[PDB]
């Protein structure tokens, strides 16, 4: 049995040698003539309240106005970012939730939960009241993130070592991807909508292929857990946050590591990461009450957000690039601009 | 000004807020308690009468709701962060199986020193107390074999049973009192297998925890 491990170690050493040979010069040193952006000051343009619990997930949708937020209160609320008015307050069967998702068509909403069942609620209906449309079950593990491909497909990640691609009408698991030898805590869909990355608690980020059904590339680092991942607008890079203070930017065409962001006086952990429309802000939450903003091309922190009193669970940049929504473990949700 | 549709939308928003607040007002009557314990130690017998088992009971016009998590995986450092606002974490161990007992203390320590769940005071229980007396009276096995500190321990039914019970209790008490100070404490309560007064003890301990929280929060102490 030792020969198998020797062969695996030899292959790993060969891969490491190939990566080292392919490396020419780090991005952190070539971009030295680029003038850094000035101090970025953002005020709380709006505050949304009346939830009475801890916010866990939030999603914007294809439009820049509507916003879906979920919490442990047992109510999933749809807001309005221009007038701070509520549209729907959908109850939940199970009090414990961990994720929410807003469909690109603007007609369906997806929940999660500490249970194994992923619920899909309808919005546009003849009667005028939101009712549960589907309940996809049989996963054996708490869900972490739900994402919509279109109105007839959905991709989910759970606590066990699997990521599933379902089918709303049939209800069965169309495809399943196995790996990560541990928990899976993040998900994000590429703009091409053909590939998607997943981050695990094994300190591994993998690039799953939707069409085929097998992993293609894997990236390692962070020395610890991973609980936040996001893409780059180009589609050839992605950013990953970790349990320690570091946030890393990984290249997709070449399986390397480009830059790492961390300060010597930071001892907290990262909860959510999301880029900007132009891809030069890399907004990142933190375990402590603050939330920093990094210059993506040159690792010089620029500006800070005041933040809430408990923590920063989810942070989202709108598709138009003119708003940043931050949730928290206290009920208040803040829209900055 | 604002058009008619905007005013109607604002009125609907106000009605939604009123209904949501009125519905959430009933979330304070029920007190939520988590349950933790070992597989061999009784977990559904202390309180008479994937998944999440739930138990509801009523003591002196107070409603208690208890959650037991089962069907998940062994690694529990991620889904336990949700149980951050629970009133108490009932902990049930076994005091009649020495071999596994050393494991149980670890489950008490990691919970006590956790960065989250820090301000939640556990309510310890010691099941299978009747078997402890039978095992102590018999001389086939002695607790000194696994615990080398028992041979010199002195007392701070038969006296041997009392000494063994107090040693077992102090083993958890020391771990509880070493780390945390002024935020949470433990309660041994020395239960039995078929005792029918557990609900009263849980009610009294919850009252004490709530009173301590109010005193600390209002700044009186």
């Amino acid at each position, epitope marked *: 049995l030792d020969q198998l491990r020797q062969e695996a170690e030899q292959l790993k050493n060969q891969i490491r040698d190939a990566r080292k040979a392919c490396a020419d010069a780090t991005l952190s040193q070539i971009t030295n003539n680029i003038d850094p952006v000035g101090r970025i000051q953002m005020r709380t343009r709006r505050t949304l309240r009346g939830h009475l619990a801890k916010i866990y997930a939030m999603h914007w949708g294809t439009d820049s106005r509507l916003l879906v937020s979920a919490s442990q209160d047992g109510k999933l609320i749809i807001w309005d970012s221009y007038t701070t*008015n509520k549209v729907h307050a959908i109850p939940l069967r199970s009090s414990w939730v961990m994720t929410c998702a807003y469909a690109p068509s603007g007609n369906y909403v997806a929940c999660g939960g500490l249970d194994n069942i992923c619920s899909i609620y309808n919005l546009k209906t003849r*009667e*005028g*009241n939101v009712r549960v449309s589907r309940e996809l079950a049989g996963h054996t593990g708490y869900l972490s993130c739900c994402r919509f491909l279109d109105d007839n497909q959905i991709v989910t990640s759970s606590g066990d070592t699997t990521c599933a691609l379902w089918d709303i009408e049939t209800g069965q698991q169309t495809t399943t991807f196995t790996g990560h030898t541990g928990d899976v805590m993040s998900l994000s869909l590429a703009p091409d909508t053909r590939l998607f990355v997943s981050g695990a608690c094994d300190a591994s980020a993998k690039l799953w292929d939707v069409r085929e059904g097998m992993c293609r590339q894997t990236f390692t680092g962070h020395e610890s857990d991973i609980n936040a991942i996001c893409f780059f607008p180009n589609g050839n890079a992605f950013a990953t946050g970790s349990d320690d203070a570091t946030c890393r930017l990984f290249d997709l065409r070449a399986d390397q590591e480009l830059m790492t962001y961390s300060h010597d006086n930071i001892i907290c952990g990262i909860t959510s990461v999301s880029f900007s429309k132009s891809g030069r802000l890399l907004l990142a939450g933190y375990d402590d009450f603050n939330c920093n903003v990094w210059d993506a091309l040159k690792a010089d922190r620029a500006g800070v957000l005041a933040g809430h009193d408990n923590r920063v669970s989810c942070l989202g940049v709108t598709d138009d690039g003119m708003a940043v929504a931050t949730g928290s473990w206290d009920s208040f949700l803040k829209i900055w601009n | 000004s604002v*058009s008619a549709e905007d005013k*109607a*939308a604002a*009125e609907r928003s106000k*009605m939604i807020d009123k209904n949501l607040r009125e519905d959430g007002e009933k979330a304070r009557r029920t007190l939520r308690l988590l349950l933790l314990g070992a597989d061999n130690s009784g977990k559904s017998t202390i309180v008479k009468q994937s998944g999440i088992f739930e138990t509801k009971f009523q003591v002196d016009k107070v409603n208690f709701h208890m959650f037991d998590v089962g069907g998940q995986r062994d690694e529990r450092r991620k889904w336990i962060q949700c149980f951050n606002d629970v009133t108490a974490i009932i902990f049930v161990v076994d005091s009649s199986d020495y071999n596994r007992l050393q494991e149980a203390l670890n489950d008490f320590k990691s919970i006590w020193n956790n960065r989250w769940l820090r301000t939640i005071s556990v309510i310890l229980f010691l099941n299978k107390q009747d078997l402890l007396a039978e095992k102590v009276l018999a001389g086939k096995s002695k607790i000194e074999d696994y615990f080398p500190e028992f041979a010199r321990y002195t007392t701070p039914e038969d006296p041997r049973v009392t000494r063994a019970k107090y040693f077992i209790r102090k083993e958890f008490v020391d771990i509880s009192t070493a780390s945390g100070d002024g935020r949470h404490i433990c309660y041994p309560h020395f239960t039995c297998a078929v005792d029918t007064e557990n609900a009263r003890r849980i009610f009294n301990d919850c009252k004490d925890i709530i009173l301590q929280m109010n005193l600390k929060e209002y700044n009186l102490v």
Partner: single-chain antibody
Amino acid sequence: DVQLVESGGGLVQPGGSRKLSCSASGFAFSSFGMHWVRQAPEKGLEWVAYISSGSGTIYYADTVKGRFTISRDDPKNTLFLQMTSLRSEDTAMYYCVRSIYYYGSSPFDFWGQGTTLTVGSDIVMTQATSSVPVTPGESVSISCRSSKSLLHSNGNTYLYWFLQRPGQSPQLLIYRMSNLASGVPDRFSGSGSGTAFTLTISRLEAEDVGVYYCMQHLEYPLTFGAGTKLEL
């Protein structure tokens, strides 16, 4: 299957009183703020009453205020209109109309069958009432002109189009502009500037003959149009 059934018809001697009821079954009645609409014989539609969700606000028409009363009952799912001190001119047919107001919603969706009863500062909402001859297989356009510009600061323009067949209750085709209610085909279109509006019908069919009505919603006293008829 949304059902709205109304009753309370008959004949009234002048100076009398009556009560009309509208029963709803099929949807959630507690969230819909319903209206009333009155149509005189061989005349255009008129707005006569209103009630909002939760009875927060109640509006009337300046020619009717002080003689009617309107009240909804959610537990019985019934809308009541009590009418006192009638006049010889208040003989018409009544329609029970629903509406739900939020972002992206659509008011004036389902119209009741209708019960018969025989005994200053508003917007003109005027349009040409002359009949427009039509032939299947050709496109037509219907105009609508207002007095006050309907383009609010929010960017929306509140102008609705309604179609009524010769023997059926009216149904909503286009709410606001360029928005089509679910169930109608894609042939119908609507376009125009702030003060002029036009509804275009392409690939005309046999069942599209009827009367078309313009409507506004800026000022709360609503005024329907005269109605344009399509024949042959």
